[PDB]
Amino acid sequence: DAVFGDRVRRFQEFLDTFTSYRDSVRSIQVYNSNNAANYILPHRIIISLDDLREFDRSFWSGILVEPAYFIPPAEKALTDLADSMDDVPHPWKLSFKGSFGAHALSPRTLTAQHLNKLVSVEGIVTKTSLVRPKLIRSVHYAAKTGRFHYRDYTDATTTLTTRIPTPAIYPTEDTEGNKLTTEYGYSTFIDHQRITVQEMPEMAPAGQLPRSIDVILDDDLVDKTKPGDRVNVVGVFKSLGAGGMNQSNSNTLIGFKTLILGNTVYPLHQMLTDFDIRNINKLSKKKDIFDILSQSLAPSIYGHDHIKKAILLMLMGGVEKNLENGSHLRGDINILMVGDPSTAKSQLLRFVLNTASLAIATTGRGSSGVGLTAAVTTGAMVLADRGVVCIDEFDKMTDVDRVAIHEVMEQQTVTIAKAGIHTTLNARCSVIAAANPVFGQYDVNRDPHQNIALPDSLLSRFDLLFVVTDDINEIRDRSISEHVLRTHRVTIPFLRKYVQYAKERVIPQLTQEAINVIVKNYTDLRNDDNTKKSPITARTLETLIRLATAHAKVRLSKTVNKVDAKVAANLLRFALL
Amino acid sequence: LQYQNEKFLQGTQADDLVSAIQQNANHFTELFCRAIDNNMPLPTKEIDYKDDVLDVILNQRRLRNERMLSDRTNELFPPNLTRRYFLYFKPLSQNCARRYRKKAISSKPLSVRQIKGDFLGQLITVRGIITRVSDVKPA
């Protein structure tokens, strides 16, 4: 098979001239040794198909037309180059970016002209078969004759090419009659999984049923995708199994089930580099930025500057403080929105969701267990930890759940005694909720209480209760009209990048500039508002501090300030008045 | 871990176990534990026979075997049958793991998700809630 050698010597040349990949292999060889010096990376080198055409078209057309004869000599060549690297103290994997395609196909259009040829499928992935080990290298120890003894197991998906099947069990006294004990943990196991892929629901032609084909995901690729995710798989299209023709009478016509091996799995729908962080740093000094930011949330939504301000102040959230040998005070801020429909309350929340960096959305009922583990024989709020939970139609939700939400929100933990596993597990999530007024449109005129409909402590738990009115005016109307019109005919993405660095860097602590302000304010609130309106408690005070610290994060300031205190004052005022 | 320090620096230098154990960790149960047979105190004290149930069985086995063999001459019961004890390794978390051997620790209280096919045949700590807890039966 000197031609397989030719493929290797040919793919050799491609690397190191040009050398643009070799630096990445070196990077892989170095990073792991750096982990060796410490006190994880899959070994595979993504090959852009882009570059392959510049050198040889003959070898380019081959990878697409007949990948079985080509990918493995190229692979053996990649290992061969990884061993000439540095130094001592594995098969790897190819990837194939592309430069698609031909071979571009959705799963609906495929079979057989596209079989035994590289393929990039795309569609929804369900139901994602459960992750499981797969044996490859057999390793044994002989005694007292010693040495070291190994067998090599060839499965159906071994390499690419078909080979005389090795399986199964263990060699167990290979000649001469010496005993062989299985050596576990020297022997190699590559993980293995399969996931079926349905064509995109929106490009479905008719009431004709969906056609899905299965993709086996080797090695690292495993557990890279939850089911229901947009996926563009790549891989060689393989037909495995006899069609029944192997066994002699299997009489049925049905046969040759097909699947795709490998390979990449690019998902479809943070890194701050050098320049971005500089942009932030420059932008932090400007005094008015908060208002611009607060406007950046709402391309499609009028006014509500105060509410947008709020959502930012939730995205940041008052650090977290865990006292020595004592309970921790709640860091994050929770928000509610109440008003007549068309208030965008349900529209706002999706935009909360997108840029939120997590978390799970929940709408009314909803449930079961909401955040709970349910103690499965034989949830959200937990899985949403360090994130933004959305709740829609927050009123509709059964009181049974609310009882638990009390425990989630302030206390900050979830407790499960159910049968069972008995544990206190932590859900520290931030929370938004939008909830319709009691009955009809009556919210606006109706009393400060009896309007909310969901007493009582809940009303308190939420740091901010914002009320919005749909009441109509002609002027405001016109001003609605134009923007609505233009809509149908500084960057927003920069907003989350702006946010993460702000979140882990750096926590502003607290300063004696401010305290007297929030104390004055607080005492004012209790004393005067308890005549004006309700509810007010120490909780409000806590919230004051969280808001202060959050606006400090917006300012990037290593310290809390008086101005910030005044801001918190302002928004909590518009909350109240 | 403590022993290697005395056997290294502080020589004379020797091959490592703590990495080599958890690297395999099955093989040592049949190897590290059989050594106990060679150094164990023979009498040891006041052992008798019965006393214990089923020890008398094997005692009479080796008595009749010794007698009948010593009569015949006028290849032995396996070392795993005679034990009556179990060898259990424990993880090094550890307060003294800070020696430091660094990467030596698993003993990494890992996620069930973190579990890989590359951890087979290597001691691993895991954590989670007990499920279904099947009732004991003799092996």
Side-chain angles (χ1 to χ4, degrees):
Chain A
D1 55 341
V3 285
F4 177 93
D6 279 0
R7 292 306 172 266
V8 177
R9 290 177 296 187
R10 184 63 65 179
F11 184 95
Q12 279 300 148
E13 188 275 350
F14 178 72
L15 271 74
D16 174 73
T17 56
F18 58 92
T19 186
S20 303
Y21 291 143
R22 171 180 303 273
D23 53 21
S24 179
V25 193
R26 181 56 181 173
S27 180
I28 296 294
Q29 301 285 92
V30 163
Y31 175 80
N32 54 44
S33 177
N34 287 336
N35 290 330
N38 199 343
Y39 291 149
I40 297 94
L41 279 194
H43 315 267
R44 60 166 60 212
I45 292 105
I46 282 194
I47 297 200
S48 194
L49 285 182
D50 180 23
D51 294 1
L52 273 184
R53 292 172 283 169
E54 285 62 6
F55 179 62
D56 271 335
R57 171 63 173 195
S58 179
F59 181 91
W60 158 263
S61 82
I63 289 177
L64 308 179
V65 170
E66 289 173 346
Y69 297 146
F70 282 4
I71 186 167
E75 184 67 34
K76 182 57 173 59
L78 183 142
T79 57
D80 196 3
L81 192 72
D83 294 332
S84 56
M85 292 305 280
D86 182 275
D87 191 65
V88 176
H90 191 72
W92 296 84
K93 274 300 167 41
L94 289 166
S95 90
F96 287 174
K97 178 179 307 179
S99 285
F100 290 141
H103 305 157
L105 62 80
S106 295
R108 188 166 184 84
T109 66
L110 172 147
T111 189
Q113 288 93 1
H114 301 290
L115 192 149
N116 187 34
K117 293 178 193 310
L118 209 159
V119 157
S120 61
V121 162
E122 65 280 1
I124 312 295
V125 156
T126 179
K127 47 185 63 179
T128 309
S129 297
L130 179 140
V131 181
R132 196 175 273 191
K134 166 162 232 166
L135 166 56
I136 294 169
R137 197 158 182 76
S138 186
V139 163
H140 298 293
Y141 189 57
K144 291 177 173 308
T145 71
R147 304 180 171 265
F148 198 72
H149 290 86
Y150 72 91
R151 173 57 56 94
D152 190 17
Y153 294 152
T154 57
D155 184 1
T157 82
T158 195
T159 60
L160 295 174
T161 68
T162 69
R163 200 168 281 99
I164 308 100
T166 312
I169 66 177
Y170 301 114
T172 309
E173 295 302 320
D174 181 65
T175 60
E176 60 282 1
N178 310 141
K179 311 287 303 187
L180 303 166
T181 54
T182 75
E183 302 294 324
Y184 288 155
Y186 191 69
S187 49
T188 80
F189 308 82
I190 297 196
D191 187 345
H192 168 286
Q193 177 185 17
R194 70 196 274 154
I195 303 301
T196 41
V197 183
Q198 278 192 350
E199 72 272 23
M200 295 302 310
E202 68 274 9
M203 60 184 297
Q208 188 164 348
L209 56 87
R211 295 200 287 267
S212 50
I213 56 101
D214 48 353
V215 175
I216 294 169
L217 295 181
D218 298 331
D219 203 356
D220 64 318
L221 317 176
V222 172
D223 191 56
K224 285 312 170 180
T225 59
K226 50 181 184 295
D229 280 350
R230 305 297 186 279
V231 169
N232 174 5
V233 184
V234 175
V236 171
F237 195 67
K238 207 186 166 56
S239 67
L240 47 76
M245 302 181 165
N246 201 28
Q247 64 275 24
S248 308
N249 300 339
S250 75
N251 289 337
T252 44
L253 271 58
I254 62 179
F256 286 159
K257 71 181 168 293
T258 44
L259 46 78
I260 318 171
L261 309 194
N263 214 321
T264 59
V265 191
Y266 319 85
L268 58 92
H269 298 82
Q270 188 169 353
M271 57 196 84
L272 294 172
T273 63
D274 290 344
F275 174 76
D276 298 341
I277 185 170
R278 186 183 69 80
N279 294 282
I280 292 104
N281 289 287
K282 184 184 72 65
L283 192 145
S284 63
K285 275 72 179 183
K286 297 167 61 180
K287 270 66 180 180
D288 188 66
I289 59 173
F290 173 74
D291 188 6
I292 291 172
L293 295 172
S294 297
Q295 291 180 335
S296 61
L297 300 179
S300 66
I301 297 172
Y302 301 111
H304 300 296
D305 285 344
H306 296 164
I307 288 173
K308 301 295 183 292
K309 294 177 187 298
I311 291 172
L312 259 64
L313 289 175
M314 181 185 72
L315 291 175
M316 304 303 178
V319 186
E320 177 67 11
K321 184 176 171 61
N322 195 343
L323 301 175
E324 184 276 335
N325 74 0
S327 178
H328 67 286
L329 281 75
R330 182 189 70 198
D332 63 353
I333 296 96
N334 297 333
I335 295 97
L336 184 145
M337 298 174 71
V338 56
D340 291 344
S342 67
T343 303
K345 60 181 69 178
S346 296
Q347 182 61 63
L348 176 61
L349 295 178
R350 297 305 182 90
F351 170 71
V352 172
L353 186 147
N354 292 336
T355 63
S357 175
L358 285 69
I360 295 98
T362 64
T363 61
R365 59 175 72 89
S367 297
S368 298
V370 188
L372 254 68
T373 62
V376 173
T377 61
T378 62
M381 188 70 74
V382 179
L383 295 174
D385 182 354
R386 295 288 184 184
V388 176
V389 174
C390 299
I391 295 170
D392 299 348
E393 294 296 320
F394 176 81
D395 58 354
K396 300 292 183 291
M397 295 180 73
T398 64
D399 58 354
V400 175
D401 186 12
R402 299 183 183 278
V403 179
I405 295 173
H406 290 166
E407 181 64 13
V408 169
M409 294 181 65
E410 187 178 11
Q411 190 66 58
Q412 207 74 48
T413 66
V414 177
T415 52
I416 299 167
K418 185 182 290 181
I421 295 98
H422 301 163
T423 189
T424 299
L425 51 83
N426 287 280
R428 51 174 296 171
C429 305
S430 59
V431 176
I432 296 177
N436 292 131
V438 183
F439 296 96
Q441 60 183 20
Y442 292 143
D443 186 8
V444 176
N445 193 342
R446 182 179 288 177
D447 293 347
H449 296 293
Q450 299 168 336
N451 194 343
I452 299 99
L454 49 85
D456 187 4
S457 178
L458 286 172
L459 276 66
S460 62
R461 296 283 182 270
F462 293 147
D463 290 345
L464 301 175
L465 295 171
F466 293 163
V467 178
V468 183
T469 64
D470 185 70
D471 284 344
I472 59 100
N473 300 133
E474 59 182 340
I475 301 97
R476 299 286 288 175
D477 176 8
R478 178 59 63 87
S479 62
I480 305 304
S481 66
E482 291 97 3
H483 179 194
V484 173
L485 294 174
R486 74 178 65 193
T487 301
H488 296 286
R489 302 181 71 251
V490 203
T491 68
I492 297 196
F494 174 86
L495 192 155
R496 60 178 62 84
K497 292 179 297 301
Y498 178 83
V499 177
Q500 65 180 20
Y501 178 80
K503 290 172 64 181
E504 66 267 1
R505 291 185 181 176
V506 177
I507 60 104
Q509 295 91 5
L510 191 144
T511 60
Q512 191 169 354
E513 290 295 320
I515 294 169
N516 294 127
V517 175
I518 64 173
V519 172
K520 178 180 68 66
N521 190 344
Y522 173 77
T523 58
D524 182 6
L525 290 175
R526 291 186 66 84
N527 295 336
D528 295 346
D529 189 10
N530 289 335
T531 58
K532 301 298 183 182
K533 292 181 297 298
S534 296
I536 300 295
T537 56
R539 193 178 306 281
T540 62
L541 188 145
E542 295 180 351
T543 64
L544 291 174
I545 288 174
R546 300 180 189 84
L547 270 66
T549 300
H551 189 279
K553 289 178 181 175
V554 177
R555 181 181 291 177
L556 278 72
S557 175
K558 180 61 173 172
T559 57
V560 172
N561 191 337
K562 180 180 76 179
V563 178
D564 294 340
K566 302 293 179 64
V567 176
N570 190 339
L571 287 179
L572 196 146
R573 290 295 185 277
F574 177 80
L576 273 65
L577 283 74
Chain B
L1 195 268
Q2 304 294 153
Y3 178 68
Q4 305 178 319
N5 298 144
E6 186 59 30
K7 281 327 287 186
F8 185 62
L9 303 152
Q10 273 75 4
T12 60
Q13 62 176 20
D15 267 20
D16 178 275
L17 280 177
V18 188
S19 280
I21 291 173
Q22 57 165 18
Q23 186 56 252
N24 194 320
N26 194 23
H27 193 195
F28 290 93
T29 58
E30 300 179 344
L31 188 147
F32 181 90
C33 190
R34 65 180 284 287
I36 291 194
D37 180 39
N38 298 334
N39 54 42
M40 179 172 287
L42 62 80
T44 59
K45 45 188 299 183
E46 63 181 330
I47 61 171
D48 305 332
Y49 53 110
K50 175 84 159 44
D51 184 1
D52 202 14
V53 59
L54 173 155
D55 182 27
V56 287
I57 307 180
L58 174 61
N59 203 343
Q60 291 176 336
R61 296 294 173 81
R62 296 193 172 264
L63 187 149
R64 67 179 297 271
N65 189 18
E66 184 176 3
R67 190 176 186 259
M68 295 295 95
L69 192 142
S70 300
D71 298 325
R72 188 179 62 188
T73 189
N74 192 31
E75 303 285 329
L76 197 140
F77 301 164
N80 192 28
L81 188 147
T82 77
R83 298 291 293 280
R84 204 187 164 279
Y85 65 84
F86 285 109
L87 200 142
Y88 299 142
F89 307 82
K90 82 170 71 171
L92 62 80
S93 307
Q94 189 62 50
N95 300 333
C96 75
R98 283 197 174 73
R99 177 72 55 191
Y100 61 96
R101 206 172 164 79
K102 48 195 194 68
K103 311 173 58 69
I105 61 171
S106 308
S107 181
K108 196 185 52 180
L110 49 81
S111 188
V112 201
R113 299 297 180 87
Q114 176 67 57
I115 306 182
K116 203 173 177 297
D118 293 333
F119 296 172
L120 278 166
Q122 295 181 336
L123 195 151
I124 70 182
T125 306
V126 317
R127 67 167 58 189
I129 286 88
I130 302 297
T131 301
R132 154 93 48 87
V133 60
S134 84
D135 291 339
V136 51
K137 295 194 59 63

